[PDB]
Design an enzyme around this catalytic site. Structure first.
Site, PDB file in Angstrom:
ATOM      1  N   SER A   1       1.967  -6.174   9.144  1.00 37.27           N
ATOM      2  CA  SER A   1       1.432  -6.691  10.110  1.00 37.27           C
ATOM      3  C   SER A   1       2.398  -6.873  11.229  1.00 37.27           C
ATOM      4  O   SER A   1       3.391  -7.962  10.144  1.00 37.27           O
ATOM      5  CB  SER A   1       0.815  -7.469  10.870  1.00 37.27           C
ATOM      6  OG  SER A   1       0.841  -8.147  11.803  1.00 37.27           O
TER       7      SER A   1
ATOM      8  N   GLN B   1      -2.857  -9.438   5.062  1.00 36.89           N
ATOM      9  CA  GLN B   1      -4.287  -9.541   5.367  1.00 36.89           C
ATOM     10  C   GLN B   1      -5.062  -8.622   6.262  1.00 36.89           C
ATOM     11  O   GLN B   1      -5.836  -7.682   5.475  1.00 36.89           O
ATOM     12  CB  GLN B   1      -4.998 -11.062   5.872  1.00 36.89           C
ATOM     13  CG  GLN B   1      -6.392 -10.726   7.193  1.00 36.89           C
ATOM     14  CD  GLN B   1      -7.475 -10.901   7.932  1.00 36.89           C
ATOM     15  OE1 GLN B   1      -7.060 -12.639   7.569  1.00 36.89           O
ATOM     16  NE2 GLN B   1      -8.583 -10.730   7.532  1.00 36.89           N
TER      17      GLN B   1
ATOM     18  N   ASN C   1      -9.002  -0.363  11.405  1.00 31.32           N
ATOM     19  CA  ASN C   1      -9.089   0.266   9.781  1.00 31.32           C
ATOM     20  C   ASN C   1      -8.933   1.811   9.569  1.00 31.32           C
ATOM     21  O   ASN C   1      -8.615   2.512   9.129  1.00 31.32           O
ATOM     22  CB  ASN C   1      -8.955  -0.752   9.047  1.00 31.32           C
ATOM     23  CG  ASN C   1     -10.775  -0.682   8.568  1.00 31.32           C
ATOM     24  OD1 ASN C   1     -11.712  -0.108   8.501  1.00 31.32           O
ATOM     25  ND2 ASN C   1     -10.984  -2.309   8.572  1.00 31.32           N
TER      26      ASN C   1
ATOM     27  N   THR D   1      -2.690 -12.729  18.826  1.00 33.86           N
ATOM     28  CA  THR D   1      -3.826 -13.656  18.137  1.00 33.86           C
ATOM     29  C   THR D   1      -2.828 -14.572  17.752  1.00 33.86           C
ATOM     30  O   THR D   1      -3.230 -15.116  16.479  1.00 33.86           O
ATOM     31  CB  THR D   1      -4.444 -13.174  17.425  1.00 33.86           C
ATOM     32  OG1 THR D   1      -4.894 -14.366  16.600  1.00 33.86           O
ATOM     33  CG2 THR D   1      -3.712 -11.705  16.359  1.00 33.86           C
TER      34      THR D   1
ATOM     35  N   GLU E   1      -1.932 -15.738  -0.152  1.00 28.36           N
ATOM     36  CA  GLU E   1      -3.123 -16.643   0.261  1.00 28.36           C
ATOM     37  C   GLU E   1      -4.334 -15.658  -0.506  1.00 28.36           C
ATOM     38  O   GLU E   1      -3.865 -14.743  -0.966  1.00 28.36           O
ATOM     39  CB  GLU E   1      -3.266 -16.550   1.606  1.00 28.36           C
ATOM     40  CG  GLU E   1      -3.085 -15.741   2.068  1.00 28.36           C
ATOM     41  CD  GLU E   1      -4.262 -15.470   2.739  1.00 28.36           C
ATOM     42  OE1 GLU E   1      -5.681 -15.589   2.423  1.00 28.36           O
ATOM     43  OE2 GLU E   1      -4.346 -14.995   3.924  1.00 28.36           O
TER      44      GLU E   1
ATOM     45  N   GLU F   1       9.135  14.740   3.417  1.00 29.08           N
ATOM     46  CA  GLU F   1       9.622  15.590   4.961  1.00 29.08           C
ATOM     47  C   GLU F   1       9.199  14.478   6.269  1.00 29.08           C
ATOM     48  O   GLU F   1      10.790  14.807   7.394  1.00 29.08           O
ATOM     49  CB  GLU F   1       8.479  17.017   5.089  1.00 29.08           C
ATOM     50  CG  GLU F   1       8.823  17.724   4.006  1.00 29.08           C
ATOM     51  CD  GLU F   1       8.826  19.289   4.337  1.00 29.08           C
ATOM     52  OE1 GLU F   1       8.195  19.636   5.363  1.00 29.08           O
ATOM     53  OE2 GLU F   1      10.165  19.819   3.569  1.00 29.08           O
TER      54      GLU F   1
ATOM     55  N   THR G   1       3.531 -13.090   5.897  1.00 33.18           N
ATOM     56  CA  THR G   1       3.315 -12.508   4.773  1.00 33.18           C
ATOM     57  C   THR G   1       3.478 -10.966   5.345  1.00 33.18           C
ATOM     58  O   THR G   1       4.450 -10.272   4.819  1.00 33.18           O
ATOM     59  CB  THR G   1       1.468 -12.338   3.983  1.00 33.18           C
ATOM     60  OG1 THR G   1       1.232 -13.782   4.061  1.00 33.18           O
ATOM     61  CG2 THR G   1       2.353 -11.634   2.610  1.00 33.18           C
TER      62      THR G   1
ATOM     63  N   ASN H   1      -3.316  -2.353  18.330  1.00 36.39           N
ATOM     64  CA  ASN H   1      -4.366  -2.222  18.753  1.00 36.39           C
ATOM     65  C   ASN H   1      -5.226  -2.720  20.393  1.00 36.39           C
ATOM     66  O   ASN H   1      -6.453  -1.776  19.619  1.00 36.39           O
ATOM     67  CB  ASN H   1      -4.996  -4.174  18.078  1.00 36.39           C
ATOM     68  CG  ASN H   1      -4.254  -4.231  16.690  1.00 36.39           C
ATOM     69  OD1 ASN H   1      -3.114  -5.392  16.808  1.00 36.39           O
ATOM     70  ND2 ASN H   1      -4.983  -4.234  15.409  1.00 36.39           N
TER      71      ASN H   1
HETATM   72  N1  LIG Z   1      -8.767  -2.991   9.886  1.00 36.17           N
HETATM   73  C1  LIG Z   1      -8.323  -5.002   9.523  1.00 36.17           C
HETATM   74  N2  LIG Z   1      -7.435  -5.188  10.457  1.00 36.17           N
HETATM   75  C2  LIG Z   1      -7.042  -6.618  11.209  1.00 36.17           C
HETATM   76  C3  LIG Z   1      -7.878  -7.131  10.239  1.00 36.17           C
HETATM   77  N3  LIG Z   1      -7.961  -8.896  10.015  1.00 36.17           N
HETATM   78  C4  LIG Z   1      -6.337  -9.097  10.680  1.00 36.17           C
HETATM   79  N4  LIG Z   1      -5.705  -7.172  11.293  1.00 36.17           N
HETATM   80  C5  LIG Z   1      -4.347  -7.008  11.881  1.00 36.17           C
HETATM   81  O1  LIG Z   1      -3.611  -8.025  11.781  1.00 36.17           O
HETATM   82  C6  LIG Z   1      -3.140  -8.589  12.588  1.00 36.17           C
HETATM   83  C7  LIG Z   1      -2.642  -9.923  12.148  1.00 36.17           C
HETATM   84  O2  LIG Z   1      -2.233 -10.177  11.033  1.00 36.17           O
HETATM   85  P1  LIG Z   1      -1.369 -11.121  10.178  1.00 36.17           P
HETATM   86  O3  LIG Z   1      -1.125 -12.522  11.540  1.00 36.17           O
HETATM   87  O4  LIG Z   1      -0.080 -10.322   9.750  1.00 36.17           O
HETATM   88  O5  LIG Z   1      -2.005 -12.122   9.135  1.00 36.17           O
HETATM   89  P2  LIG Z   1      -1.558 -13.055   7.500  1.00 36.17           P
HETATM   90  O6  LIG Z   1      -0.015 -12.589   7.952  1.00 36.17           O
HETATM   91  O7  LIG Z   1      -2.594 -12.743   6.383  1.00 36.17           O
HETATM   92  O8  LIG Z   1      -2.128 -14.866   8.970  1.00 36.17           O
HETATM   93  P3  LIG Z   1      -3.074 -15.471   8.598  1.00 36.17           P
HETATM   94  O9  LIG Z   1      -4.682 -14.899   7.998  1.00 36.17           O
HETATM   95  O10 LIG Z   1      -3.378 -17.067   8.596  1.00 36.17           O
HETATM   96  O11 LIG Z   1      -3.054 -16.248   6.345  1.00 36.17           O
HETATM   97  C8  LIG Z   1      -3.884  -8.490  13.863  1.00 36.17           C
HETATM   98  O12 LIG Z   1      -3.659  -8.788  14.825  1.00 36.17           O
HETATM   99  C9  LIG Z   1      -5.073  -7.147  13.157  1.00 36.17           C
HETATM  100  O13 LIG Z   1      -4.554  -6.603  14.366  1.00 36.17           O
HETATM  101  C10 LIG Z   1      -9.246  -6.895   9.094  1.00 36.17           C
HETATM  102  O14 LIG Z   1      -9.761  -7.699   9.265  1.00 36.17           O
HETATM  103  N5  LIG Z   1      -9.570  -5.583   9.542  1.00 36.17           N
END
Ligand SMILES: Nc1nc2c(ncn2[C@@H]2O[C@H](COP(=O)(O)OP(=O)(O)OP(=O)(O)O)[C@@H](O)[C@H]2O)c(=O)[nH]1
Ligand SMILES: Nc1nc2c(ncn2[C@@H]2O[C@H](COP(=O)(O)OP(=O)(O)OP(=O)(O)O)[C@@H](O)[C@H]2O)c(=O)[nH]1
Ligand SMILES: Nc1nc2c(ncn2[C@@H]2O[C@H](COP(=O)(O)OP(=O)(O)O)[C@@H](O)[C@H]2O)c(=O)[nH]1
Ligand SMILES: Nc1nc2c(ncn2[C@@H]2O[C@H](COP(=O)(O)OP(=O)(O)O)[C@@H](O)[C@H]2O)c(=O)[nH]1
EC number: 3.6.5.-
Lengths: 118, 428, 34, 45, 433, 428, 434
Positions: free
Chosen positions: E133, E11, E221, E172, E64, E247, E138, E199
């Site tokens: 992330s 995500q 983002n 989170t 997902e 590079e 994932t 972040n």
């Molecule tokens: N720009 C942007 N960054 C995001 C967004 N959502 C999450 N992030 C970053 O992504 C981090 C968490 O990503 P993941 O925990 O890997 O999300 P995931 O693996 O898909 O896990 P689930 O959502 O529960 O399926 C957060 O700490 C944010 O820093 C978003 O909507 N926009």
């Protein structure tokens, strides 16, 4: 970084001419020529070889911030002229009793000039 | 038909070469397309040296533009004089050195030296007498210093008599442009010392000073720097293009300069560089051209000549000047600055007086200097190199391309050695 | 001299552009409610 | 107008100028001392 | 001939991708419906199909639906080939295991196929820009799986891993510590340059330099997108000193392991503060060093620089860039390691940063530095301290053990992570001689 | 052909030399743009002593402007004759001297001396036969004193056989302008004594006296005060600028006024000075020129020559005048006033008489007097220095910049060891 | 090449700042929006063109409490000061040096030193750092000390003047002022260069008698302090005859190490009505600066000896009339002068006539500003000591200081060095009898 010298063109790349007013790093003036190869001191991962008598300073630089600095900071200028022996002793023992301020990246770099009246 | 094959290499090379041809074409008339829309037929009497007429009165530049990823090449084709070059004389690839000398002299270089060599051969065997080859490159960075050095070596083997002038933007002193620059340079010089004839050295911090302190420009572009290097690259080859008293070609400049084989890293310098507002407070007279040319603030390489001895100076004056106003100023600039000129060599200055000045200037003068102070450049790159090799810094991206460490070690030795020759003859 | 004039002008152009964006960006901050 | 030689004593002053700013035609840039040409003098004219 | 493929994963990646591609479509005109309104510069990111349609060379992958099942109904639905957007049917539920062993070995096949197809329609690939992330499944699990196989196939091909790294305080996820240590043990010898953008840092920068007290993952983002558009401006627009993807590695990553460069941007003003600022090459450069304008909460002053790469997009006259790096090389606040005499890469382009109707302002010049500071030791120390506050009580180990990750791994992982600590320290010591 | 390199150091030096360049540009016919707009061919005959040739008939002063605070040069440029100097001779440094001899001599001025000497070297080698240097400065205060004497020492070790004239504005007897004028004057005179060949001491109080009592000026400005020093400047370098009978250049004047090497401090004087109520009462003749010359009212130093004996005297006339009147007047003044002249030097006065006066007059006269009365000035600085130095007052910065106790002790002892040979001639 | 960073610290500062920068503006034209209404480079001493024609003040207003700085962020000059140059905080410092050099002050130090560096990395030739504060307040005495010390660590031997509001000789607006004042002088005795001192009680009288303002407020006073900052910086902004930079006031005033407390006094401070009857001539303006009823620091200069006095003539001042005046004042045996200072009168003759703010004071075509270091400031230090002791005796109001980070002992070391200061003024006074 070693901050080498541009030889003829140094009045440009002097610190106060490049608009740097904080006390800046010095420039290395004379470049020393060595001959032959230079032996390896580390390994593939970057770890030093075992023999290799190492340094004693911290692996990170000693940036002593606004909460690590000693209170009652000694002055940058001290010229001991027309000053008594007791006051001269007080100021010199002050700047000697603050040692870690003297050895730092954001250090004091004091100028200790002059001579008190015996 | 003394002729020249300009082999450009890497971003620096192609970019510097683009401006070389712009500068050279303007003097010889060749237009954006390639037609002689010029005046004095003299601008067409010796166009063979750099141009090859193509059915239709079009003059194509003898230039093999090399690179490891069509990039600067696109900019070259988009720039003014970018269609002047022949589509095929552009040998490129599909990868990129990534500031890696290895990915230029071994990996992505090997599979692209045949193509370049094949064009050099079509452009060399089509000549009545090829004086030699020029190479605009950058010792600091891959391609120009990787594929470039491989090329010089190969050309040398095939044609071993023709000259091999190499204009090289040497790793500047104060600020850098590539972290692997120490490594790259040490390796490239180990090859040039034993594959070239006249390697001019053009640091950039130097050219910047000449732009802000002499020309007085408060907004310099890489273009203005190119023009200055493209003017020195033009002075050296004036007598092999235009008439003049005491003529002097490329072989002559070498013979009357390179003292002992190796010692051949020269420092360039132009002369009538003036300001758009100071050309009202100065005077274009040979006397003044002499002073500007012999002031350690005009040299295009940070190596204060003063910290050293000039083993041989070269002075190619373009213009109608009085031999005794030139011959004299040379003697005086040598007899009134004795500590900075070797005493084991009389008359340490050669002198060419061509008779067609750079369009716009009454008199001009390029300055080739074989100073002993050039040690500073090699000694700085060796110190920067020892600081890295000592602790295998950025070296996996070299031993992972195949470069054994013996190679790297050797490089330092050759360079460190050369660092002595200069001091041996810099102190009797 | 001409060169400088063109440069100074571009800066004033950007000036107004950004000046505008400001007003049209402060709005989204005043949209925190709606 | 009155044309007198530049001998001492003849340096009469204009007591109407109230503007006395000096312009900085000598200054520093990226390492170097730029020497600009003065487009204005004392008083802003 | 200068193509690059993006492999947005998770995500996090799928959302950093939205902003990135909005900016990429704007830069090259490519409309939201994939149709450049009546030149070949999009080929770096967009391939053109016969029916005048510039499709993105990217592979958005989430284990997902939802996240990607919203880019297929969004304003950019007629841009992405309905096969690039690969979606699973069960999230890895914050479990590196359910993303490197379970729900994941059932998607790697398709993903690598779509990558090959996009990688066969490319004459010269500069490299793969991955986005993950270092916290979720994932993001950790798949990125590893992908990177490991990406290596086996495209071997020498670069693999730049733009990544969101755990933050000093905020977080989170309770199982974040674990996931992170695990991914950085498998992507430590199969990756290349790993740009970290925490972040908390951006959140702060926003409030401080843009005055957006309460931001949102979007505001973030967008800024991360401008960083990527800066690393790939030479592969598209024109410049004075161009830097290929290849590079950014050679001239940055010192020793194999130390492959975790940090990030920072300049002119981060808000079109109102930019009215009182000059935004000169010196102002912009000194700001790319200021510890308050860094994209990973960590004061570099309490550390030692190893290789900073400063990119310059806009009207950057060369001499300005020189005086700037030179003034830095004089200030004491900034200190470097001994093994790195020359320590600055310089890339001067010409395309002024683009404005995506959002928050930042139109600026003439703007820079982006990727420093390899040794001050990131605190991050690894902190991260491992947490992996140890838990892998001691064997907490949440039953989850990973029940999807694969044989418990043994946790240990071997923390051991390599202890080596990371050692390296950073030693690779910053000195020698009396 | 003879040349003079003009150095102006300090605020006072910059302003006095700016007024002097105005004076001599009026005399030679150089407009503010830099051309020639004149009437006689005698102005270009000897213009290559202060003006270098440039392109298209530009004449540019051979002057080096030195100041560690680039603010007074700014007003000099903004003045009328601002666009006449070389922009490359505007050697400034970003700093502040703060009226420290220590800071002008042993610190930051030492960071500008290299660029200053580069410009001085260029101007000196752009000549045929250089005769010396003319430095304008003020002893009271920094920059002019400290940096000025550093250039004095450097230029003297570079050229040891050239005449050095220091127009020095000495500290005032009545009031003062810098607190540490005793310190600056003591150190700068200590430098001046074993260095320069000619020193002209101008005192501002004497300038005020000759502007209020003689000229009857109502509102004298520093332009007016600088103008009379400029008039003496133009008067002394007259014989090598305009033709005449019994020419006396700077070296001939030095030979005829110093009997001993340390006794080179002089007292200047100009005397076609008349008030606005009295130029139409004026009775123009060479005897009134001698009378208005020799009286202790137009002396430009605050040293009454009636309180001592004249060692040596010079008069440089400027105008078509008879020789009988000049010779008989300067025998008559010595024959009448016999206790004011030394008896061991018979006829202790020199005469030069050039033909071309300043434009606006018909006779001009410049007085140079080496007299015993300068003992008053040096002694006055001696008790001021002793009263400031017993209590170690204001020694804080002089020792904070690097200097020592022995510096000031040696300076005071040297100035006393010059006060002794001045007073030994009053008692023979 | 003549820029001067100004760090205004505390209500007094932020407030004198408003006055100072208004005069700065009306002088160079910079309107209350930056945009100069031209259609030249003198403004650089205090302003920094952005290129879009906006001139931004070169200053760093710093106040641990909001309010004061916030009324500047919403007022006539709300578009001039770059937001990040107006650095306020959240909590105050309750007239407690302690919570200004130790607790609620060591938090804003990092950011202020930060801003000061950026306003320095844009200067092509800094002259110094004019710090304006009040000896008697948390930020005024606390933040200044910390700021001054930390500055010395960085900018080492760089000039650092200190315009200050010295404790009053009778009025006072606090009960703990004496303490903060003695503590401040101690931490700045060796870290400051030439700290100028202006007492408020004094200006109050100079405004009731010479400027006909029966009920003066802080603004009438603040605006007169702005005229003094102009003369001290006029030379490096406008052309003159004898320029005086900000590095000479440290050399031609501060005599021996410690002693560094010059006193301020202005001239032509008349009032319209009483200006239709005055030839305000160089002499009159000068004699006035030495009258013991104009010294803007209640300290009868007669009960002491002058050590060094640097006059600054701004306007139409014939250089000759200056020499004449200084002579007359020297003769007058009333005005005294130490023996170790034969020449004690420095002179600076600029040309730009004093600027008239649409408000008060007359339009004078001549005005002087004296900055003497009289030994008569000793009475003030003695009075401050009586106070410090009358309280330290019962360790009164010390709980608050030990209640922040000031170890009781520090109070002793402070007054002890203030006693040394007094003994110094005795020596620098006595005249060698030899
Ligand atoms: N720009 C942007 N960054 C995001 C967004 N959502 C999450 N992030 C970053 O992504 C981090 C968490 O990503 P993941 O925990 O890997 O999300 P995931 O693996 O898909 O896990 P689930 O959502 O529960 O399926 C957060 O700490 C944010 O820093 C978003 O909507 N926009
Ligand atoms: N000209 C002028 N002087 C002031 C002003 N405010 C205070 N002063 C003087 O300064 C002294 C205290 O001021 P400060 O030290 O600045 O007060 P502070 O440091 O801001 O402390 P607090 O505001 O009480 O938290 C008083 O005794 C006044 O004499 C002002 O606004 N203008
Ligand atoms: N004179 C000049 N030098 C240039 C120009 N462009 C680049 N350089 C120099 O070239 C060096 C880097 O070139 P490099 O990366 O090795 O190009 P490559 O050969 O394609 O790899 C830099 O240090 C620049 O100073 C130019 O247009 N003119
Ligand atoms: N004749 C003359 N003397 C001047 C002028 N300007 C300044 N002075 C003298 O210069 C002296 C101080 O100058 P100084 O301190 O040396 O300036 P600095 O060199 O910049 O430090 C004063 O005593 C003035 O009498 C001028 O225009 N003409």
């Amino acid at each position: 970084a070693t901050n080498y010298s541009a030889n003829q063109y140094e009045k440009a790349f002097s610190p106060r001419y490049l608009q740097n007013w904080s006390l800046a790093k010095p420039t290395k003036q004379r470049i020393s020529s060595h001959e032959g190869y230079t032996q390896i001191i580390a390994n593939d991962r970057g770890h030093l070889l075992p023999s290799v008598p190492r340094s004693k300073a911290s692996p990170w630089g000693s940036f002593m911030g606004t909460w690590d600095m000693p209170l009652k900071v000694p002055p940058a200028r001290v010229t001991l002229t027309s000053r008594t022996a007791a006051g001269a002793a007080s100021l010199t023992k002050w700047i000697q009793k603050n040692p870690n301020l003297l050895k730092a990246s954001n250090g004091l770099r004091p100028e200790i000039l002059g001579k008190p009246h015996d | 038909m003394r002729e020249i094959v300009h082999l450009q290499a890497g971003q620096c090379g192609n970019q510097i070469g683009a401006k070389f041809w712009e500068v050279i074409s303007d003097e010889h008339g060749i237009d954006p397309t390639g037609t002689y829309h010029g005046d004095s037929d003299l601008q067409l009497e010796r166009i063979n040296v750099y141009y090859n007429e193509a059915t239709g009165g079009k003059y194509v530049p003898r230039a093999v533009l090399v690179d490891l990823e069509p990039g600067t090449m696109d900019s070259v084709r988009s720039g003014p004089f970018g269609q002047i070059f022949r589509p095929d004389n552009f040998v490129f690839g599909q990868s990129g050195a990534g500031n890696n000398w290895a990915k230029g002299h071994y990996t992505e270089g090997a599979e692209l030296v045949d193509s370049v060599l094949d064009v050099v051969r079509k452009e060399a065997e089509s000549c009545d007498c090829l004086q030699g080859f020029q190479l605009t490159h950058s010792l600091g960075g891959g391609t120009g210093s990787g594929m470039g050095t491989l090329l010089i070596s190969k050309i040398r083997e095939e044609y071993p008599d023709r000259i091999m002038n190499t204009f090289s933007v040497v790793p500047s002193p104060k600020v850098s442009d590539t972290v692997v620059e120490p490594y790259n340079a040490t390796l490239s010089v180990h090859q040039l010392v034993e594959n070239t004839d006249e390697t001019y050295c053009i640091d950039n911090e130097a050219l910047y000073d000449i732009c802000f302190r002499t020309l007085k420009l408060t907004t310099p572009t890489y273009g203005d720097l190119n023009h200055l290097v493209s003017a020195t690259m033009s002075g050296v080859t004036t007598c092999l293009r235009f008439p003049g008293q005491l003529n002097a070609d490329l072989r002559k400049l070498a013979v009357n300069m390179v003292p002992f084989p190796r010692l051949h890293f020269f420092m360039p310098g132009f002369a009538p560089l003036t300001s758009r507002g100071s050309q009202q407070y100065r005077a274009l007279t040979v006397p003044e051209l002499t002073q500007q040319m012999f002031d350690a603030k005009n040299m295009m390489a940070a190596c204060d000549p003063r910290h050293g001895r000039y083993l041989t100076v070269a002075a190619v004056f373009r213009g109608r000047m009085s031999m005794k106003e030139v011959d004299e100023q040379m003697l005086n600039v040598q007899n009134k600055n004795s500590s900075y000129f070797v005493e084991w060599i009389p008359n340490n200055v050669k002198t060419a007086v061509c008779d067609i000045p750079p369009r716009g200037l009454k008199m001009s003068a390029t300055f080739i200097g074989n100073s002993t102070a050039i040690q500073e450049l090699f000694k700085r790159i060796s110190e920067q190199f020892t600081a890295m090799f000592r602790r295998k810094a950025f070296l996996h991206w070299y031993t992972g391309e195949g470069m054994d460490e013996m190679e790297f070690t050797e490089a330092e030795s050759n360079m460190n050695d050369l660092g002595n020759p200069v001091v041996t003859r810099g102190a009797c | 001299e001409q060169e400088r004039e063109l440069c100074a002008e571009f800066r004033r152009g950007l000036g107004s552009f950004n000046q505008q964006l400001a007003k049209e960006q402060k709005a989204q901050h005043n949209y925190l409610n709606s | 107008v009155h044309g007198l030689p530049f001998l001492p004593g003849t340096s009469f002053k204009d007591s109407t100028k109230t503007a006395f700013h000096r312009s900085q035609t000598l200054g520093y840039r990226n390492g170097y001392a730029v020497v600009r040409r003065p487009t204005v003098g004392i008083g802003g004219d | 001939q200068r193509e690059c493929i993006s492999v947005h994963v998770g995500q996090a990646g799928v959302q950093i991708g939205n902003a990135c591609w909005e900016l990429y479509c704007l830069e090259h005109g490519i409309q939201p419906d994939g149709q450049m309104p009546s030149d070949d510069s999009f080929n770096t990111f967009f391939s053109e199909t016969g029916a005048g349609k510039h499709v993105p060379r990217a592979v958005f992958v989430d284990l997902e639906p939802t996240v990607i099942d919203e880019v297929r109904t969004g304003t950019y639905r007629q841009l992405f080939h309905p096969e690039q957007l690969i979606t699973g049917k069960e999230d890895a539920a914050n479990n590196y295991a359910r993303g490197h062993y379970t729900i994941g070995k059932e998607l790697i096949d398709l993903v690598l196929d779509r990558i090959r197809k996009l990688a066969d329609q490319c004459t010269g690939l500069q490299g793969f820009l991955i986005f993950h992330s270092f916290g979720g499944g994932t993001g950790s699990g798949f990125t590893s799986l992908l990177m490991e196989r990406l290596s086996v196939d495209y071997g020498k091909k670069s693999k730049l891993e733009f990544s969101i790294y755990p933050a000093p305080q905020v977080s989170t996820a309770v199982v974040e510590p674990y996931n992170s240590i695990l991914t950085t043990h498998t992507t430590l010898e199969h990756s290349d340059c790993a740009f970290m953008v925490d972040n908390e840092a951006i959140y702060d920068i926003c409030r401080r330099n843009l005055d957006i007290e309460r931001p949102t993952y979007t505001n973030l983002n967008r800024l991360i997108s401008q960083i990527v558009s800066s690393i790939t401006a030479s592969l598209r627009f024109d410049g004075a000193l161009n830097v290929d993807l290849t590079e950014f590695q050679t001239n940055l990553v010192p020793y194999p392991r130390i492959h975790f460069p940090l990030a920072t941007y300049a002119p981060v003003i808000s079109a109102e503060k930019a009215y009182h600022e000059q935004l000169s090459v010196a102002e912009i450069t000194n700001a790319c060093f200021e510890p308050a304008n860094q994209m990973v909460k960590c004061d570099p002053r309490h550390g030692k620089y190893m290789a900073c790469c400063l990119l310059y997009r806009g009207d950057v006259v060369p001499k300005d860039v020189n005086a700037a790096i030179a003034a830095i090389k004089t200030k004491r606040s900034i200190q470097f390691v001994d093994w790195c005499p020359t320590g600055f890469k310089v890339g001067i382009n010409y395309q002024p940063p683009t404005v995506v109707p959002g928050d930042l302002a139109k600026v003439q010049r703007a820079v982006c530095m990727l420093s390899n500071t040794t001050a990131i030791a605190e991050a690894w120390a902190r991260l491992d301290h947490k992996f140890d506050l838990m892998y001691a009580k064997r907490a949440f180990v039953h989850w990973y053990v029940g999807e694969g990750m044989e418990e043994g791994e946790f240990s071997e992982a923390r051991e390599d992570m202890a080596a990371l600590e050692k390296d950073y320290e030693e690779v910053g010591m000195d020698s009396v001689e």
